[PDB]
CSV table of C-alpha atoms (C1' of nucleotides) and ligand atoms in Angstrom, one decimal:
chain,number,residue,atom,x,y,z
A,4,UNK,CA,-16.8,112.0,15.4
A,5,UNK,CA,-13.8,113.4,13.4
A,6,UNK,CA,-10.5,112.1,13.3
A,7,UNK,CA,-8.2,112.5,16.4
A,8,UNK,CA,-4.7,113.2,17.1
A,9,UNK,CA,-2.3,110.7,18.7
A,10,UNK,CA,1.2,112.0,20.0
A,11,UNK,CA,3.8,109.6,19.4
A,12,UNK,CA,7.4,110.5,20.6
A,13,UNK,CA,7.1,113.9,19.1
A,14,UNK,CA,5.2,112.9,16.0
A,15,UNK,CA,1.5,113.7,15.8
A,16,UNK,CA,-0.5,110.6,14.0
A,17,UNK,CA,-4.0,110.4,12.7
A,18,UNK,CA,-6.8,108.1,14.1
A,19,UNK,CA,-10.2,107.1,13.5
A,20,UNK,CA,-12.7,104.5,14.5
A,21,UNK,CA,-11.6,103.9,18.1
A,22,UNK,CA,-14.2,101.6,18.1
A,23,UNK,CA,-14.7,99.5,15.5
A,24,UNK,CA,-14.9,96.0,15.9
A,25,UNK,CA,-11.9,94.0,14.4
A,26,UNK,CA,-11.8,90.8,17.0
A,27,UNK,CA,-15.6,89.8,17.5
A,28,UNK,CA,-15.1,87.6,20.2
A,29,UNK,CA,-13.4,89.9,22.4
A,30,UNK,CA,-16.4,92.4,23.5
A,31,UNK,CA,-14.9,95.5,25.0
A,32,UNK,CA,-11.3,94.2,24.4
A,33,UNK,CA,-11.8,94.0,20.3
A,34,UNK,CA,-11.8,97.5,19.3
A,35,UNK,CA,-9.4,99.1,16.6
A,36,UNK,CA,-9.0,101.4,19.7
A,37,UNK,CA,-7.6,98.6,21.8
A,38,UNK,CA,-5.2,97.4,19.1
A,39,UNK,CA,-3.7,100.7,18.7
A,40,UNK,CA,-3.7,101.0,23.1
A,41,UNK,CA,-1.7,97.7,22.6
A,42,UNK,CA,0.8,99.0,19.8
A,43,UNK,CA,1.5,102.0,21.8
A,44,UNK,CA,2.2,100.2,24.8
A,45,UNK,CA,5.1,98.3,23.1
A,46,UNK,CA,6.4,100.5,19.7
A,47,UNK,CA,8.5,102.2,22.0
A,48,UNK,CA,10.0,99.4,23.4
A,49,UNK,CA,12.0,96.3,22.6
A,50,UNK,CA,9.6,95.9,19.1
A,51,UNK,CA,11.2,98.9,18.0
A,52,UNK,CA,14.4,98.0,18.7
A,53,UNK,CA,14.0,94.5,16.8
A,54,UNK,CA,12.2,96.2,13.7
A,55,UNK,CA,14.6,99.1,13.3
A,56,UNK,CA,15.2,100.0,10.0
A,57,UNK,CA,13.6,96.6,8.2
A,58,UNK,CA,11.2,97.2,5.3
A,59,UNK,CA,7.9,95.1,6.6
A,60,UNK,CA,4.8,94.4,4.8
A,61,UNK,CA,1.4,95.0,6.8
A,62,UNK,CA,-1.5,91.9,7.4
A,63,UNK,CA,-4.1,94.8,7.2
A,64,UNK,CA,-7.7,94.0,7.8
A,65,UNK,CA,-9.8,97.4,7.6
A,66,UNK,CA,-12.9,95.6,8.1
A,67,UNK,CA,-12.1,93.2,11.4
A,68,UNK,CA,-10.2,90.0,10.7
A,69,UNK,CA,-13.7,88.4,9.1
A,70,UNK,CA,-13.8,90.9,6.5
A,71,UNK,CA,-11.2,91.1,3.9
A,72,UNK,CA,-7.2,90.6,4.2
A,73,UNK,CA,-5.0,93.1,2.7
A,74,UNK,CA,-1.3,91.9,2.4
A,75,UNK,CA,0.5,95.3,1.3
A,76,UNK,CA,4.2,95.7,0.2
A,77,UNK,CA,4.3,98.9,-1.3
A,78,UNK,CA,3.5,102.1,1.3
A,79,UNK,CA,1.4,104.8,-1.3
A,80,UNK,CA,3.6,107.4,-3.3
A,81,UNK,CA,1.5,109.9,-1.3
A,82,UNK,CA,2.3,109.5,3.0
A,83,UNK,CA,2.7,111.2,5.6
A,84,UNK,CA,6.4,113.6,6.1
A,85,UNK,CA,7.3,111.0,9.5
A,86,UNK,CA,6.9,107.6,7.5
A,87,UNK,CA,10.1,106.3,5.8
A,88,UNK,CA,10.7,103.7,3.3
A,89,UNK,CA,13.4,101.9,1.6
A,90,UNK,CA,13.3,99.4,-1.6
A,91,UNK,CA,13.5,96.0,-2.1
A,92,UNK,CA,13.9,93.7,-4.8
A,93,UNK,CA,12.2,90.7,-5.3
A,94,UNK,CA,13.5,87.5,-6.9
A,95,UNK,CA,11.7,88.7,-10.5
A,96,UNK,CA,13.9,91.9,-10.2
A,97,UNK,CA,10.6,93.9,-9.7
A,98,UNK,CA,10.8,96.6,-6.5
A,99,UNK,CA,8.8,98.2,-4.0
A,100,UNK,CA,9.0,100.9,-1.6
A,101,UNK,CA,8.5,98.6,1.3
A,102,UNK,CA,7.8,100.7,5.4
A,103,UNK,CA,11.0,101.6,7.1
A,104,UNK,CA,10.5,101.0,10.7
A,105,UNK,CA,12.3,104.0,12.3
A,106,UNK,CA,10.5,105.5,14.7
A,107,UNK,CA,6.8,104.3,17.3
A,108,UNK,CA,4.9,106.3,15.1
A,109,UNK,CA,6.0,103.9,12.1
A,110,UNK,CA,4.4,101.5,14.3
A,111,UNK,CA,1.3,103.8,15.5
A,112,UNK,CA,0.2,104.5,11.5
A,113,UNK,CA,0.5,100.9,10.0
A,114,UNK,CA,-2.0,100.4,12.9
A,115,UNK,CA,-4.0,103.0,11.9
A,116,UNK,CA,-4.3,101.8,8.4
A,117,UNK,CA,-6.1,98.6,9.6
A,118,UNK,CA,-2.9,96.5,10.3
A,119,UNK,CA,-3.0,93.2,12.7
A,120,UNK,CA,0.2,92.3,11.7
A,121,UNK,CA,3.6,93.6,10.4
A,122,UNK,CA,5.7,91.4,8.8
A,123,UNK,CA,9.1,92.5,8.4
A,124,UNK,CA,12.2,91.1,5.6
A,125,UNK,CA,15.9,89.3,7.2
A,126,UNK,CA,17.4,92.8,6.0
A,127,UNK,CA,18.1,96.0,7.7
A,128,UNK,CA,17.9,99.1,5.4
A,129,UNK,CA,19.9,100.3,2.9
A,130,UNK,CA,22.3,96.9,3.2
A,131,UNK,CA,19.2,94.9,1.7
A,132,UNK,CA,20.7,92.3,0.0
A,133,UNK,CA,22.3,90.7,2.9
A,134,UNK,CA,20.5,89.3,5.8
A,135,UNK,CA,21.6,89.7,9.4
A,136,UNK,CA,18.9,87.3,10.9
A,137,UNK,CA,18.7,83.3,9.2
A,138,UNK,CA,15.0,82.5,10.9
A,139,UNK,CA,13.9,78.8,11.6
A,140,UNK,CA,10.2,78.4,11.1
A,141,UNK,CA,8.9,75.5,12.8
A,142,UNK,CA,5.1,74.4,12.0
A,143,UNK,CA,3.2,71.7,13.4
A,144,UNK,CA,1.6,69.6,10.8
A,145,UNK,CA,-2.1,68.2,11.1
A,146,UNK,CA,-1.8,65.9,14.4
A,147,UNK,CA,0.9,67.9,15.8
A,148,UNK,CA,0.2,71.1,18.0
A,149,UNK,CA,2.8,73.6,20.2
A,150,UNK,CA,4.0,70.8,22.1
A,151,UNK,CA,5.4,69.8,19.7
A,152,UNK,CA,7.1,72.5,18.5
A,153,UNK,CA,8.4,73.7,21.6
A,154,UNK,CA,9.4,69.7,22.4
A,155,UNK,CA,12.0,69.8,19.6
A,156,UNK,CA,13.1,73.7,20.0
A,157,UNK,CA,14.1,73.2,23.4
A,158,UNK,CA,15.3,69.6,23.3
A,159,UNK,CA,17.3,68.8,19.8
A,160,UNK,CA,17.4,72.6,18.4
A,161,UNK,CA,18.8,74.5,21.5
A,162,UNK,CA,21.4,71.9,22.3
A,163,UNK,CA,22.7,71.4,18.5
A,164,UNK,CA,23.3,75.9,18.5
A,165,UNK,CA,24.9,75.3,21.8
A,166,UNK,CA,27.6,72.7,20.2
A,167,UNK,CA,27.8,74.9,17.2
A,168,UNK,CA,28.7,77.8,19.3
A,169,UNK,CA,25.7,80.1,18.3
A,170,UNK,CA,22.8,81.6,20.3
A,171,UNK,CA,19.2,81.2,19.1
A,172,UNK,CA,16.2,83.4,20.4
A,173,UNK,CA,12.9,81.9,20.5
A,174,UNK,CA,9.5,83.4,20.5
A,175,UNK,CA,5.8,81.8,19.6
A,176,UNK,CA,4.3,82.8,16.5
A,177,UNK,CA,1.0,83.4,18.1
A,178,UNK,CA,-0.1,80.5,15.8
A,179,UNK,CA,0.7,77.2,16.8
A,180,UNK,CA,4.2,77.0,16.1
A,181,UNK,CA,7.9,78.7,16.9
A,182,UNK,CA,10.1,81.1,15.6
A,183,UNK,CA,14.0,80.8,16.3
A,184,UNK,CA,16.1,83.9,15.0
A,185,UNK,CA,19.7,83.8,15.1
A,186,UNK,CA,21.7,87.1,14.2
A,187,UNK,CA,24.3,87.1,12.0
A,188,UNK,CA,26.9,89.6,10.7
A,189,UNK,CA,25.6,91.0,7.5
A,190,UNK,CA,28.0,89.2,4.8
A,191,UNK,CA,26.0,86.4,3.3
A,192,UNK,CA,23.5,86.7,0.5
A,193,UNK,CA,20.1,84.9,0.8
A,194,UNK,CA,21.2,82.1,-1.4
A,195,UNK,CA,23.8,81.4,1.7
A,196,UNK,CA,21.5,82.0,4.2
A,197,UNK,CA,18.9,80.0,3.0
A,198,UNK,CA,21.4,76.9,2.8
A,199,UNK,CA,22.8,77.4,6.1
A,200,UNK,CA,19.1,76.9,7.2
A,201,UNK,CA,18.8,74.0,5.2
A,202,UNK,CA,22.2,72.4,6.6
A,203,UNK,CA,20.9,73.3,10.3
A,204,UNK,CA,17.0,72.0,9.8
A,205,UNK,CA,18.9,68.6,8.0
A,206,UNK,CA,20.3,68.3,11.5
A,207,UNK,CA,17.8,68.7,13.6
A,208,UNK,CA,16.1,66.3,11.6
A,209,UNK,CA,18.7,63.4,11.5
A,210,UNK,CA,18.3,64.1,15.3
A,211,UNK,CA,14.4,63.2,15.5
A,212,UNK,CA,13.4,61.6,12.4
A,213,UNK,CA,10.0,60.6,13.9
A,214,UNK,CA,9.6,63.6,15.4
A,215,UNK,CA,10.8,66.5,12.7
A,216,UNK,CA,10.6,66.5,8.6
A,217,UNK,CA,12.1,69.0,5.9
A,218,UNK,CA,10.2,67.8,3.4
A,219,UNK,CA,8.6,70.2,1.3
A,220,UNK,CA,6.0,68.1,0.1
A,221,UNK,CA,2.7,67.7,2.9
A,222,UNK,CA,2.4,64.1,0.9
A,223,UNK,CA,6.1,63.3,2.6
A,224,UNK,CA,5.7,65.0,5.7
A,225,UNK,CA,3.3,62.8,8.0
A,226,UNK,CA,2.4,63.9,12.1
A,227,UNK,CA,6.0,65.1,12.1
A,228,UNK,CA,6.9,69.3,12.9
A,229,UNK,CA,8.1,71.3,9.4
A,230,UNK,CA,10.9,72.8,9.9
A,231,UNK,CA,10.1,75.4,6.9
A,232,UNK,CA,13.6,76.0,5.2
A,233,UNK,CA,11.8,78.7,2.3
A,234,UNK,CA,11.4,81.0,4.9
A,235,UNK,CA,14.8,81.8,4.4
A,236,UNK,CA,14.3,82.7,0.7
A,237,UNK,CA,14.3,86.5,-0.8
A,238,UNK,CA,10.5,87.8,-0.7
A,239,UNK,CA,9.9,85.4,2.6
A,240,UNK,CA,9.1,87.3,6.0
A,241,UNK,CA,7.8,86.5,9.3
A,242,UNK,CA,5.2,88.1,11.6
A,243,UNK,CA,7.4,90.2,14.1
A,244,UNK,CA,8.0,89.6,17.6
A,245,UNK,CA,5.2,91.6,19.5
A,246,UNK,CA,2.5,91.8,16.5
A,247,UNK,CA,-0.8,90.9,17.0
A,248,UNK,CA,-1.8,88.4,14.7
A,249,UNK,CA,-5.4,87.4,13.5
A,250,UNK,CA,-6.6,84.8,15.8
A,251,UNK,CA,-9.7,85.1,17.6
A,252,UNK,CA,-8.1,86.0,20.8
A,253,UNK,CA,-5.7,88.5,19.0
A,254,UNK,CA,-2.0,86.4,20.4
A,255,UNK,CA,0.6,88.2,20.1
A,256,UNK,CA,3.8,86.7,18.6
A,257,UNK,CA,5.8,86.7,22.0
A,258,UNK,CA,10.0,86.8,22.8
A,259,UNK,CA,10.8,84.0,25.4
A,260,UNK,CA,13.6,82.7,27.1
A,261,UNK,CA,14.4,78.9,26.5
A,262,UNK,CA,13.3,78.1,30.2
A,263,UNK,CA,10.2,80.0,29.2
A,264,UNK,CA,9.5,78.2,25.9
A,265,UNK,CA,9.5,75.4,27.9
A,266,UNK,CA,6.2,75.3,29.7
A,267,UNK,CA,4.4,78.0,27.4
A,268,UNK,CA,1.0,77.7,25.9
A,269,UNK,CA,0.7,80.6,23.4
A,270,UNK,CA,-2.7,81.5,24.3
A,271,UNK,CA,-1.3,83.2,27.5
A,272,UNK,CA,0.4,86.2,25.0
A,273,UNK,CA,-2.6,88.5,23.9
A,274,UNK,CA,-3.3,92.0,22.9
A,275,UNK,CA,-5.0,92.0,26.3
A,276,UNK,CA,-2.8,89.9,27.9
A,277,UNK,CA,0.9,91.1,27.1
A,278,UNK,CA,1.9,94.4,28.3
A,279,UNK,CA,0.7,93.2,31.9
A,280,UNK,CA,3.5,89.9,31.5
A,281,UNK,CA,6.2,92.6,29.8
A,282,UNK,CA,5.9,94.7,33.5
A,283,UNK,CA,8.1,93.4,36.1
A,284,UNK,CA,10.3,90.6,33.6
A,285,UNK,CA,13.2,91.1,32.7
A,286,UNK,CA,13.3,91.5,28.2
A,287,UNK,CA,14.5,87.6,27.1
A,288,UNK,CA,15.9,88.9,23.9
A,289,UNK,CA,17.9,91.7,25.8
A,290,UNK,CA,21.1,90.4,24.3
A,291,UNK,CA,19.9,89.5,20.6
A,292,UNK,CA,22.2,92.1,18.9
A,293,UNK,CA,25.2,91.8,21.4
A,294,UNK,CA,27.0,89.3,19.0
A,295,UNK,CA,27.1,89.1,15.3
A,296,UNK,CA,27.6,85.6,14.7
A,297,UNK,CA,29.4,84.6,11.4
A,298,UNK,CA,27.8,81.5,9.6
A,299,UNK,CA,30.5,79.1,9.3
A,300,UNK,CA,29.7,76.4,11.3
A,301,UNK,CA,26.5,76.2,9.4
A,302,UNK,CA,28.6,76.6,6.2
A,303,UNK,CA,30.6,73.7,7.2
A,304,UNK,CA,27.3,72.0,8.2
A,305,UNK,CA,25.9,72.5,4.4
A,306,UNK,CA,29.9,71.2,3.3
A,307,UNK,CA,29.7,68.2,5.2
A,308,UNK,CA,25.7,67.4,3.7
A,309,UNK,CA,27.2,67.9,0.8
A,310,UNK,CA,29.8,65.1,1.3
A,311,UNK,CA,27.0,62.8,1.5
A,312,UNK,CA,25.2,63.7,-1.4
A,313,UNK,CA,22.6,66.4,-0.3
A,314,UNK,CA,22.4,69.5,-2.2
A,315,UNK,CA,20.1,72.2,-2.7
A,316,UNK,CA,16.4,72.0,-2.2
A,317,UNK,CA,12.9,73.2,-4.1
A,318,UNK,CA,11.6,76.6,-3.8
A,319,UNK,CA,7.9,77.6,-3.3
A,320,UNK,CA,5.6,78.4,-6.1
A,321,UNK,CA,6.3,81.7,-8.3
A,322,UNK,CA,10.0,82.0,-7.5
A,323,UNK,CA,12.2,81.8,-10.8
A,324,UNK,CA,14.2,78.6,-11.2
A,325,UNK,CA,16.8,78.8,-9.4
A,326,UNK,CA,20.7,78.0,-9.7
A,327,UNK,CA,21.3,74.6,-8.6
A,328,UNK,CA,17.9,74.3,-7.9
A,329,UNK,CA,16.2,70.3,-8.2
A,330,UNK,CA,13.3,69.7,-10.0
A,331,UNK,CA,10.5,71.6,-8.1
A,332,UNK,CA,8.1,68.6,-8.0
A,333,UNK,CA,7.1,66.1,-5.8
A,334,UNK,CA,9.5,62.9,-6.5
A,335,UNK,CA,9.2,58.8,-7.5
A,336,UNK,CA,6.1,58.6,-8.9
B,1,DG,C1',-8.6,103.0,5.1
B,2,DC,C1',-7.7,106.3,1.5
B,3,DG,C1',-8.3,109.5,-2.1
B,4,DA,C1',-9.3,110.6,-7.2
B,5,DG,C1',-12.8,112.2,-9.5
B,6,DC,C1',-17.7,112.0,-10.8
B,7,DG,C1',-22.7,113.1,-10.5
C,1,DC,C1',-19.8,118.5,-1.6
C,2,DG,C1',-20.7,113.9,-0.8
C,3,DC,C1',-20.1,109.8,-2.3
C,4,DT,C1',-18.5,105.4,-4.8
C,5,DC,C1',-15.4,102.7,-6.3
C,6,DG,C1',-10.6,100.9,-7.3
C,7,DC,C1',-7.2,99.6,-4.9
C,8,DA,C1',-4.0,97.9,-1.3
C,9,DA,C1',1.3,90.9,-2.2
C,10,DC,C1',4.7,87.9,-4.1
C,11,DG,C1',3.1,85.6,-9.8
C,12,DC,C1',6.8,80.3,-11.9
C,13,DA,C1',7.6,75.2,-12.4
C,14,DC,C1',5.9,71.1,-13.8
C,15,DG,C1',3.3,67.1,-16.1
D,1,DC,C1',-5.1,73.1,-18.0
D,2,DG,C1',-4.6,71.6,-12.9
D,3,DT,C1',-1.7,71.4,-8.9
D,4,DG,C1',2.4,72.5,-6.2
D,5,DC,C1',3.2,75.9,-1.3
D,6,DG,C1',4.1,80.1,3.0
E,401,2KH,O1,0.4,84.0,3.0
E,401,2KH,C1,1.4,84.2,3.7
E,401,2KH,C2,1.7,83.3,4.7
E,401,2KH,C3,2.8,83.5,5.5
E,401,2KH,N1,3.6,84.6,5.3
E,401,2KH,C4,4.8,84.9,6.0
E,401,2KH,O2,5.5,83.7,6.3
E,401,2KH,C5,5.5,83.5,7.7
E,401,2KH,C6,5.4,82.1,8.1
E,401,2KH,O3,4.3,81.4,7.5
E,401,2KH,P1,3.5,80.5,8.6
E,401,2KH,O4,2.3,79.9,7.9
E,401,2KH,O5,4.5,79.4,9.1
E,401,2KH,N2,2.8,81.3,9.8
E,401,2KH,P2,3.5,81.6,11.3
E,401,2KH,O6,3.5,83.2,11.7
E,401,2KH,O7,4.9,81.1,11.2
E,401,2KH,O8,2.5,80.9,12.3
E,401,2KH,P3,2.4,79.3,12.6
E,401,2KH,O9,3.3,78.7,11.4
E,401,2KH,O10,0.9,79.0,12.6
E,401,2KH,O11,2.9,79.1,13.9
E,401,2KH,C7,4.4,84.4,8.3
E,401,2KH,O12,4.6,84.8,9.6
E,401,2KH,C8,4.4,85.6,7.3
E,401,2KH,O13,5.4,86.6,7.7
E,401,2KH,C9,3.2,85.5,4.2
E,401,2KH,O14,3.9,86.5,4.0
E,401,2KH,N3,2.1,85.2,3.5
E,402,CAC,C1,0.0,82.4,8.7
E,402,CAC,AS1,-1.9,82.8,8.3
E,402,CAC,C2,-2.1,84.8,8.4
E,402,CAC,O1,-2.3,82.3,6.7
E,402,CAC,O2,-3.1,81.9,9.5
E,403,MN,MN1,5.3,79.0,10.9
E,404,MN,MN1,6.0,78.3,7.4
DNA sequence: GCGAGCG
DNA sequence: CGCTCGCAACGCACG
DNA sequence: CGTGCG
């Protein structure tokens, strides 16, 4: 019942406990050994392609995703010779050696070492203080679902980047919201960044004020979508496209086209489901590193919010006060 | 899931 | 030699 | 101290 051997690309990978149960609900389907069928069925693919050379932190769950959750930054001083890693510096000025995505059997080990999800940084390796992907992170609050979410991504989101001249790339999280990453030409900071999402989720909210809130406050935010503008922050990362997350069902975070987006029900994009729906379609995000778009007409966005008065905005717990920053508290008493 | 180190 | 146990994220601002 | 928030 010893360890076995996987061949990845060249690069031989250690595995155990084909069948342990990490997703209870799925019988047969559920299995460590089913997770790492899925990963090598796509860490060739376009989720190499998207990860290369990021530092990601893993969502490992040795135990099953009812057992214990293991957020990891740091890979172990000792690894094995194939894995690569690079550092990055969080907002304290502490580091960590963070995974490397290089190769399928980056991929294949993570896996291996109990990982549902990976969850990779804006940055591409070495240049990691300057993003080349600003994010939009839309979340449903409590009596607001997908529909939502994909309601104002394809209607008031995807028609603002079209006047602005840029080109967004959606995907589900696997949770009940939407990711929209945009690439950019490395030569903003995350300071930048992270305004220029401010400036475009300030839009999209003027747009659909019933609908849509940037408020970082839940008291504030009502049955309205979040339009989380931290995400953008140094330290914040998002589940990549193609991960398994830990739902009972084991989604998938899944690249869509806009048309898609429009009708999807993220329920559809599984472990089980997705390598099946990959075959015979034509890769949505084919394109995503074609241009790299410059941030000025988000820049001019933040310039023209400033004009009315709007400036920066609070960061999350645990960051350092920043420059600029408000008062990171919940206002009028 | 791994590995240092203890009984 | 066999096993257990520690360990595997980020850690400040504000009242 | 409790509470903020992914
Ligand atoms: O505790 C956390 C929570 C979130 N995150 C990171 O922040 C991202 C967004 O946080 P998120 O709660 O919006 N989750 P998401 O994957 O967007 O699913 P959903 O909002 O339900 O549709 C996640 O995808 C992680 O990469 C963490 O690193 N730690
Ligand atoms: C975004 As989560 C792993 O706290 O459901
Ligand atoms: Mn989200
Ligand atoms: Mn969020």
């Amino acid at each position: 019942s010893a360890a076995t051997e996987l061949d990845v690309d060249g690069v031989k990978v250690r595995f155990t406990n084909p069948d342990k149960v990490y997703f209870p609900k799925l019988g047969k389907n559920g299995t460590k050994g089913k997770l790492v069928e899925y990963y090598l069925s796509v860490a060739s693919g376009p989720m190499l392609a998207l990860l290369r050379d990021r530092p990601v932190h893993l969502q490992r769950f040795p135990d099953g995703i009812e057992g214990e959750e293991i957020y990891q930054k740091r890979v172990p001083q000792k690894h094995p010779d194939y894995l690569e890693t690079c550092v990055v510096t969080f907002p304290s000025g502490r580091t960590a050696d963070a995974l490397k995505i290089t190769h399928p059997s980056s991929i294949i080990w993570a896996a291996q070492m109990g990982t549902v999800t990976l969850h990779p940084w804006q940055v591409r390796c070495p240049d990691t203080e300057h993003p080349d992907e600003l994010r939009v992170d839309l979340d449903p609050q409590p009596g607001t679902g997908f529909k939502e979410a994909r309601t104002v991504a394809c209607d008031v989101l995807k028609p603002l980047l079209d006047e602005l001249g840029l080109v967004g790339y959606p995907k589900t999280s696997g949770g009940r919201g939407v990711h929209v990453f945009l690439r950019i030409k490395p030569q903003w900071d995350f300071i930048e960044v992270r305004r220029a999402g401010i400036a475009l989720a300030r839009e999209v909210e003027r747009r659909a004020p019933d609908a849509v809130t940037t408020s970082w406050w839940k008291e504030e935010r009502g049955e309205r979508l979040f339009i989380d503008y931290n995400q953008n922050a140094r330290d914040r990362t998002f589940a990549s496209a193609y991960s398994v997350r830990k739902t009972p069902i084991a989604t998938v975070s899944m690249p869509l086209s806009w048309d898609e987006l429009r009708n999807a029900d993220p329920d559809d994009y599984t472990m089980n489901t997705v390598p099946d729906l990959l075959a015979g379609r034509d890769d949505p995000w084919a394109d995503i590193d074609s241009v790299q778009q410059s941030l000025g007409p988000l820049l001019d966005l933040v310039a023209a919010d400033e004009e009315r008065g709007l400036g920066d905005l609070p960061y999350p717990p645990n960051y350092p006060k920043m420059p600029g920053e408000p008062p990171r508290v919940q206002p009028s008493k």
